């Protein structure tokens, strides 16, 4: 429920590791990759001279 930069996302994975062990951390690592890729694609965060 914050902005989720990069520190926040490594923090999310670390606390998931420290609470749920390993298997949820791995499956959550993949789900976070897939959803991160999908919505980054949906945003079209393109760069330009303006």
């Amino acid at each position: 429920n914050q902005a989720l930069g990069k520190k926040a996302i490594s923090k999310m994975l670390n606390t998931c590791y420290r609470i749920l062990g390993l298997k949820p951390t791995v499956i959550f690592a993949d789900q976070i990759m897939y959803t991160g890729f999908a919505y980054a694609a949906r945003s079209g965060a393109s760069v330009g001279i303006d």
Binding site: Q2, A3, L4, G5, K6, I9, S10, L13, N14, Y17, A29, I32, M33, T35, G36, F37, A38, Y39, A40, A41, S43, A45
Partner: peptide
Amino acid sequence: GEPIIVPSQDVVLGLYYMTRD
């Protein structure tokens, strides 16, 4: 002990663009 499976560059852009307002 810190993780080394940190989402790196497009994925954090995807999350930072979802989870904003």
